[PDB]
Structures are given as C-alpha cells and as structure tokens.
Amino acid sequence: DEVQLVESGGGLVQPGRSLRLSCSASGFTFGDYAMSWFRLAPGKGLEWVGLIKSRAIDGTPQYAASVKGRFTISRDDSNSIAYLQMNSLTTEDTAIYYCARDFYDFWNEFSHRTFDFWGQGTLVTVSSALTQPASASGSPGQSVTITCTGSSSDVGGYKYVSWYQHHPGKAPKLMIYEVSKRPSGVPDRFSGSKSGNMASLTVSGLQAEDEADYYCSSYAGSYNFYVFGNGTKVTV
C-alpha cells in the first residue's frame, strides 16, 4: 500500500468562523497510532496544535495553550480518519495544517514522541522557541552544519530531537529522529547530534536536491509537548 495521510477542508474563510479539517489515513492499522496536528504559519515557524492517542491508551485529546479551548481533535477508527475542529478563527490562525502519525504504535516505549508520514497539508486562510540559524550554504560535495539551540526543558532534557526537511508545497519529511537516527530511506549523509542544550544536523556531500528549509523540533515535557525552531534555508 504505503502510508498515506490526506488532509482536506481548508480554504479562505471569514474571521470568527468555524471549520473542520479532515485527515484520511491509509496503509497502516489506524487504531494503533497517535495522530498529531501541526501548523506552519508565515513568519512563525512550525507549531504543534494537538494530539490524539490510540483508544488503547486513553484517547482523551491534548491541545496546545494557543488553541486550548477552541480547537477539538477527534478520531473515527471505523473509517481511519482524524479531524481538527477550529472555532472562532482569527487571522492569527492562518496557516498550512499538517496531519501526522506517531513513529510507533501504542505498544512501544518511545511512543508519543516522534511524528512522521506528514501529509501535504491543507491551507487555511482567514480574511481581513528553539534557536536556529536563519541560513546556511555550501558548495556541492562540501559539508554543512545546522544548529538547533533550545533549553534544559527541551533539547537538553530529552533524547527526542527531530529535524524535518521542507520543500514549499510538499509534505515535511523526517530526516532525523531521536537526535541521531535516520528513518528508512534517509541517506547517511544527513547526520544528527546533540550536546547539552544544542542539537546539530550535518549534511555531508551536498546535492542539488538538498536545498530546502530545515526545521528542528524537540519534545518539551508534559506541559508544552512539542516546540520548534523558526527554520533554516540551506542553499546549495
């Protein structure tokens, strides 16, 4: 099959309005995985919106301070489809909204930490925390290093630092997880590392396809869950 996530429902909407985003999964046994909603907004970086776990765990959804009380996340295990309900939409809510699968099933110890298989996202336009060097460049074949500096409560408190690669209009993609692991099919020239409060990505032997925006993320404990950097344009 392949794992596929398709988010729908976005569009130009007037303020204070309500909108439901759908995410239809395929290719895995939907019921066994947390599903997380993320947001990419211009000027801001990537943001965690909320999380719903497998019903084999609790299922009670967790949201983020921002949307805490006006968004509501939901699942339909019978049709393998997660939902994001948005209420009282302000223009500061305009963004691309992404759907995500926990890297593991509810069985695994390391569940509820890393997310993968992001969809393309659906754009919502409404009418009317980790430090990351803005830019980096190199020549093809040369090396490059990206920094992601957070605090004790995030990068330096855990072994859950991810890096995503983002091409405009395309689904963000896991390059590195758990600080230094390469998912299946990420070339060993992408390298993860950390020390204290600062993580590092290293792209050895650059390539034309390697020119992208690179976002870093860390688990940030029970209260904040996730946090991101503002992204880095690598230019080859």
Side-chain angles (χ1 to χ4, degrees), residues 3-57 59-67 69-138 140-141 143-169 171-208 210-236:
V3 189
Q4 166 137 328
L5 299 189
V6 166
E7 321 96 317
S8 46
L12 183 71
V13 303
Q14 268 59 238
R17 186 185 161 185
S18 276
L19 197 75
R20 186 184 64 161
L21 296 197
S22 282
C23 166
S24 306
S26 157
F28 63 94
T29 168
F30 184 70
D32 303 327
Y33 293 93
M35 296 293 286
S36 191
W37 280 97
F38 295 89
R39 173 207 307 196
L40 172 70
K44 282 85 73 173
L46 279 170
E47 197 194 45
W48 176 70
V49 177
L51 177 76
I52 188 154
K53 290 200 235 156
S54 173
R55 272 141 169 183
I57 281 284
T60 170
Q62 293 174 57
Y63 317 110
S66 318
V67 302
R70 64 193 182 83
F71 299 6
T72 53
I73 278 166
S74 169
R75 301 170 74 104
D76 183 4
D77 279 354
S78 167
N79 291 306
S80 312
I81 196 177
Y83 296 104
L84 182 43
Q85 175 82 47
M86 279 154 172
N87 295 303
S88 276
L89 287 162
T90 78
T91 82
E92 298 283 23
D93 278 333
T94 293
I96 305 163
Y97 288 96
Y98 299 98
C99 198
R101 198 265 282 273
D102 187 326
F103 198 73
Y104 315 94
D105 47 31
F106 63 83
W107 301 118
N108 200 269
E109 161 182 7
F110 302 134
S111 53
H112 317 137
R113 291 314 179 249
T114 302
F115 298 86
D116 196 27
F117 308 106
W118 297 41
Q120 264 89 11
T122 187
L123 178 47
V124 181
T125 303
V126 186
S127 314
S128 313
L130 315 164
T131 313
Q132 182 153 27
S135 46
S137 51
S143 298
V144 184
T145 300
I146 296 307
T147 299
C148 170
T149 290
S151 88
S152 62
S153 307
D154 44 28
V155 182
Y158 302 77
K159 287 74 180 172
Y160 300 132
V161 190
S162 304
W163 301 82
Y164 300 78
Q165 166 184 254
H166 172 65
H167 282 143
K173 182 203 190 181
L174 270 176
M175 296 296 139
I176 290 285
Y177 75 87
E178 278 162 34
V179 173
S180 72
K181 302 186 166 53
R182 265 84 72 179
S184 81
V186 160
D188 212 50
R189 59 210 197 76
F190 285 75
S191 198
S193 194
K194 172 195 94 153
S195 52
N197 281 353
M198 164 168 154
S200 304
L201 182 55
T202 288
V203 194
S204 278
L206 291 168
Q207 316 256 18
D210 279 351
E211 189 187 311
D213 280 338
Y214 286 90
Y215 288 81
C216 81
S217 66
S218 161
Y219 179 72
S222 36
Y223 174 46
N224 293 320
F225 201 62
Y226 264 16
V227 286
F228 290 78
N230 209 53
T232 298
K233 182 64 172 180
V234 163
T235 313
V236 186

